[PDB]
């Protein structure tokens with residue numbers, strides 16, 4: 001069929017409603033609306049020779065793993081033996097050709113003016129430029145942006161339980177490792193559901209929501225397999241990924257490399273445990289809650305999360321944590 005114009009993914013009204021909500025070296029994320037329903041659109045330049053945000057563009061072969069993994073994890077919401085809604089829904093993926101839409105540059109400029117951007121203004125692409133455009137379910141607001149917005153550490157527990165269950169179901173179905181689950185990649189949306197449902201190897205359970213539904217995003221470094229065919233990002237020769245400082249996040253990259261002896265095709269679900277430890281550490285050290293722990297039952301939740309923090313690295317996988325850790329009994 002070949003690539004499509006941007007107007008195929010963003011017809012005029014949908015384009016006019018785009019607001020920028022996120023960014024990374026990879027590119028840009030916009031929110032818009034269609035059929036009365038919000039969506040997030042991730043746009044990644046590929047195949048061209050220009051540096052973009054300081055880095056070379058991925059080839060189609062390099063971007064395919066993220067595409068494949070986004071699809072696999074979305075599909076878990078509709079499976080039976082291993083089912084979870086804890087990964088973001090993927091609506092569509094397109095290969096688009098053209099220069100960047102002026103209306104998106106307008107949205108880009110607004111974000112730059114109010115929040116500031118680390119990125120280049122994407123106005124230098126020619127009409128032959130290719131992009132991958134991934135349209136996802138709108139998952140809410142990332143944990144990092146919610147640093148001061150959550151009600152209490154009770155919510156922290158539901159968040160950790162949801163994250164652990166999702167990762168476990170993906171481990172079980174797909175031998176999945178996220179590999180980059182920093183707090184910008186944990187999204188929180190209000191839900192009126194009191195309990196959320198998952199199924200792990202045929203056994204269904206529930207998790208009290210505390211009014212929030214968690215969605216895990218961004219599969220740029222992720223790994224999984226089906227029928228022994230492994231899909232992953234080979235970072236064995238990457239330099240910069242392992243030389244970060246100033247946040248426990250950057251230790252996780254080094255700790256993953258220690259665990260897997262720099263062999264990124266292998267399955268080491270302990271990496272999911274390391275990420276969950278990093279997220280628990282954020283809950284205890286960087287998040288700040290509108291209400292502190294002030295009742296017996298709540299000073300106890302705090303103690304339980306602290307216990308989790310100091311014991312969870314002795315578990316082999318998110319599956320082991322979910323099934324064996326006292327926090328989830």
Ligand SMILES: Nc1ncnc2c1c(I)cn2[C@@H]1O[C@H](CO)[C@@H](O)[C@H]1O
Pocket residue numbers: 021022023024029040042088136137138139140141142184185187217218
């Ligand atoms: N599906 C979504 N729903 C809501 N927000 C999303 C997404 C996606 I894909 C990304 N983002 C926001 O974009 C920031 C950088 O990826 C992320 O940190 C997050 O702030």
Ligand code: NI
Pocket residue numbers: 008092094
């Ligand atoms: Ni289409």
